[PDB]
Amino acid sequence: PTHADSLNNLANIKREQGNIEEAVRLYRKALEVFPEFAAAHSNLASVLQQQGKLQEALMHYKEAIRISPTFADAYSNMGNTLKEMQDVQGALQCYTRAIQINPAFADAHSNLASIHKDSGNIPEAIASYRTALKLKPDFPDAYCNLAHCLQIVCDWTDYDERMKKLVSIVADQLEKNRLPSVHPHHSMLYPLSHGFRKAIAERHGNLCLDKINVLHKPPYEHPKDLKLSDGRLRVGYVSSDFGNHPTSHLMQSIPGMHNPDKFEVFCYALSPDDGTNFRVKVMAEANHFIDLSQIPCNGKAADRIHQDGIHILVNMNGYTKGARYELFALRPAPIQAMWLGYPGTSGALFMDYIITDQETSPAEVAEQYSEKLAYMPHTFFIGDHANMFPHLKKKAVIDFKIYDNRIVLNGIDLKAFLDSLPDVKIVKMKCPLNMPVIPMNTIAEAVIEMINRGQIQITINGFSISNGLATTQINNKAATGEEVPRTIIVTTRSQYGLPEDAIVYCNFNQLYKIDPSTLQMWANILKRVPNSVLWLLRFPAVGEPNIQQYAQNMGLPQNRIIFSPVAPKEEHVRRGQLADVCLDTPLCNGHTTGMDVLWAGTPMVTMPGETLASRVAASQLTCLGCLELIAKNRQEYEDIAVKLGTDLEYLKKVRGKVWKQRISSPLFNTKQYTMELERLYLQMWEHYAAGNKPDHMI
């Protein structure tokens, strides 16, 4: 039992050090010496859980509890194991049982909070995180996870203090080689240094290198020419997001546009098949598609990649839901690049390049990243909008009393419907081509009637005319962006309770991207522009009273902020046509959301910051060729925004420019983007065929 205790204690330190294999052997020696050692079973279980041996872990947790039925820590850790196996009901039964045994057990309250948050119950997660912090006031994980909950709902109580405390917690954990409590993915939201953001990511890279050392992989041997591959670069795209995920909504066309004379495309899915057209398309069009979700061991999965012969392995996840950086730590290919999925540095030495651009990541901030900058010539950002929403390439309007954004029609067959109608007026557009106007006739009245009654659709002259609010009832695959709508769709400001006679500023991001500064700039803009409203989403809904209160306190009258629900994907893109201007979030820009609003022809005002995440919208707008929409400070952001809301001719000009340039510019041109990505990939390959080290590409 004390032979046993020293084996157990050594093992605990071996684990803390990251010598996971060593820790396992010692816990087993501990149980060899002393079978009924509840703590040794529970500790062996925790390290088996870390290794992904979830059924073996569960078995040792239950042993721990059989030996000691009041071992609340075993139940708490078992609960985390069941949560990783997706058994949320089992996870709750264990957490709640741990809190029933010891109501003062802070870790259990924190684990429970975390499952409330994941379930979309932010108010209970907040309550449980605060219980945890009441029981254990020095609890970085609970404090930082709580700061993230409060961010999500725009709770800004003691914001400046909270911000200082996050920084000092991270400093303190960085000192003492502890895994920081701020997740790499959240680190852009807080006033940390670039070293702190890089340092946070560096340490999640480190923890992958520890997990794979149990496997004992010899360094893989990497092809040094294209002889085995018939003169083709073998490019492997690794993603958890091949399915209905933003990433697929950006890049699903890229695999099948690769030049097969020079490239051979491998898609490695880390997720199982969700049944969506997004997965179907990438499986159909990639030269090779591999479901690594069927190959859970990372050793055998990185093997599966080395025997494909990959030259460039592309990491589209970053520290996200379902990433397997273990695959990239084992370096199964000679060039490993960060692309598109994660808006930050991996902080890992085992990633060579980050595919970015000069506006997103200027050279002066190259040490903000662990990777070498690999510049795309325009933006690194891409969108599949031209393929997913071609019905938004053109629009028509109904003249209710001429506005481009009160009552809007969009459809593949819109030209044929318009031509069925008597007296349609064409307005030549103020672009650097034309907008059909339907006058207020019997036809026009029938459409507005269908909107007012909440009616799903009508028929005019044989054409299907759909209510834009009812797309999931007419064609659920059109609502998700999986199919192109086959009816003419009607979109109106009345459907969203927006004013027919005022400027609509929009921002369709999750609310966490808003901070006190940003909402103060927005309130400033609304006060300068009487009439005007700010159009936000219930993302989530429990964020709305906070926003509305802090805006009431900034002297902004009631009824100047209008909230809409989160919509299906194509409604969200289509309904951006109803806004005048999009006010981008400077803390963390719209990324996918920025592409969505530009596709609708809606100008976006942005203020690029330090972080990659704060500069993506300014990169999109530079590629689009709209430099007048990029602000160098907050006064300029407000002045640009107020000008677009008052100078109506300037508004018409700027909108006309976005409308034309979404087609003319490279921003939405997936073929051009794939060709530039191919040039940049052959540069990466040359530089290493000639046996040089990764370096900056400009």
Ligand X SMILES: CC(=O)N[C@@H]1[C@@H](O)[C@H](O)[C@@H](CO)S[C@@H]1OP(=O)(O)OP(=O)(O)OC[C@H]1O[C@@H](n2ccc(=O)[nH]c2=O)[C@H](O)[C@@H]1O
Cite the annotated binding site for UDP by residue number: 510, 513, 567-569, 572-575, 591-593, 596
The reply to whether 341 sits near ligand X by the rule CB under 6 A is: yes
CA distance 37 to 1: 8
Catalytic residue annotation: 185
Annotated binding site: 510, 513, 567-569, 572-575, 591-593, 596
The reply to whether 590 sits near ligand X by the rule CB under 6 A is: yes
Find the Cα–Cα–Cα–Cα dihedral 196, 202, 204, 210, rounded to 10°: -140
| Single residue of 105, 268, 508, 535 touching ligand X by CB under 6 A | 508
Query: What is the smallest separation between the CB atom of 449 and ligand X, expressed in angstroms?
Result: 26
The reply to whether 588 sits near ligand X by the rule CB under 6 A is: yes
Radius of gyration in angstroms for the set of CA atoms belonging to the chain, rounded to a whole number: 27
| Single residue of 83, 109, 258, 591 touching ligand X by CB under 6 A | 591
CA distance 412 to 186: 40
Cβ-contact 438, 408 below 8 angstroms? no
The reply to whether 566 sits near ligand X by the rule CB under 6 A is: yes
Query: What is the smallest separation between the CB atom of 241 and ligand X, expressed in angstroms?
Result: 6
| Single residue of 31, 329, 503, 567 touching ligand X by CB under 6 A | 567
**Most distant CA pair in the chain: distance in Å?**
95
- How many helices (H) and strands (E) would you count in the chain? 29, 19
- Of 17-25, 75-83, 200-208, 508-516, the window that binds ligand X (rule: CB under 6 A) is 508-516
| Single residue of 596, 606, 618, 637 touching ligand X by CB under 6 A | 596
∠ CA 202-164-126, nearest 5°, is 90
Query: What is the smallest separation between the CB atom of 381 and ligand X, expressed in angstroms?
Result: 7
Nearer to ligand X, 24 or 621 (CB): 621
The reply to whether 572 sits near ligand X by the rule CB under 6 A is: yes
The reply to whether 343 sits near ligand X by the rule CB under 6 A is: yes
CA distance 532 to 227: 63
CA distance 178 to 175: 8
Tokens representing 498 are 């927006």
Residue with tokens 């898609």: 267
Nearer to ligand X, 147 or 330 (CB): 147
H-type alpha helices, 481-611: 516-528, 544-553, 569-575, 592-599
Query: What is the smallest separation between the CB atom of 181 and ligand X, expressed in angstroms?
Result: 19
The reply to whether 200 sits near ligand X by the rule CB under 6 A is: no
- Of 88-96, 154-162, 526-534, 592-600, the window that binds ligand X (rule: CB under 6 A) is 592-600
> Residues binding ligand X: what is the number (CB under 6 A)?
22
Strand 488-492, strand 463-467: pairing: parallel
| Single residue of 510, 520, 646, 672 touching ligand X by CB under 6 A | 510
| SS (HEC) of 173-212 | HHHCCCCCCCCHHHHHHCCCCHHHHHHHHHHHHHHHHHHH
Looking at residues 235 to 254 of the shown chain, list those that interact with ligand X (rule: CB under 6 A). Answer: 246-247, 249-250
Going 561 to 531 to 430 to 379, the CA torsion angle's sign is: negative
- Of 335-343, 420-428, 528-536, 540-548, the window that binds ligand X (rule: CB under 6 A) is 335-343
Tokens representing 613 are 């995440």
φ, ψ for residue 488 (rounded to 5)?
Answer: -85, 125
CA distance 507 to 606: 11
Nearer to ligand X, 329 or 588 (CB): 588
The reply to whether 613 sits near ligand X by the rule CB under 6 A is: yes
The reply to whether 569 sits near ligand X by the rule CB under 6 A is: yes
Query: What is the smallest separation between the CB atom of 674 and ligand X, expressed in angstroms?
Result: 17
For 391, residues 6+ apart whose C-beta sits below 8 A from its C-beta are: 410, 411, 412, 414, 484, 485, 489
Give the x-and-dash track for 520-559 against ligand X (CB under 6 A): -----------------x----------------------
Nearer to ligand X, 382 or 581 (CB): 382
Binding site for ligand X (CB under 6 A): 246-247, 249-250, 340-341, 343, 508-510, 537, 566-567, 569, 572, 588, 590-593, 596, 613
